[PDB]
Amino acid sequence: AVKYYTLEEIQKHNNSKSTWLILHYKVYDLTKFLEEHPGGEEVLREQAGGDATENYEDVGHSTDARELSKTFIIGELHPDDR
Ligand code: HEM
Q1: Is 60's C-beta closer than 6 angstroms to any atom of ligand 1?
Q2: How far does the centroid of ligand 1 lie from the alpha carbon of residue 61, in Å?
């Protein structure tokens, strides 16, 4: 099965308690990854609650980074909001 979230509910996860963001229509919960991110947490918090696909691809993450990102996927963006 697959869980779908709307932009409306995703935007609510941008506080000290929860940090979600969208990348290529997938929703990631990076709450616990903020302090481990080699790129720092400020760059993630700034994109929280929205689509950060361009900024993500702009930096050109390595293969290993993309493999690791999969562990943080909690669902996908609802088809109606794409
Ligand atoms: C999906 C979660 C993400 C994972 C697993 C992740 C992982 C990493 C890793 C492992 C690196 C080290 C370099 C590399 O291997 O490419 C890195 C660097 C970096 N990340 Fe991320 N990242 C994520 C999302 C993002 C997002 C959304 C942004 C910005 C909007 C971002 C901005 C950066 C920057 C600026 C660097 C440093 C690049 C440099 O020093 O040249 N990352 N990230």
Answers
A1: no
A2: 6
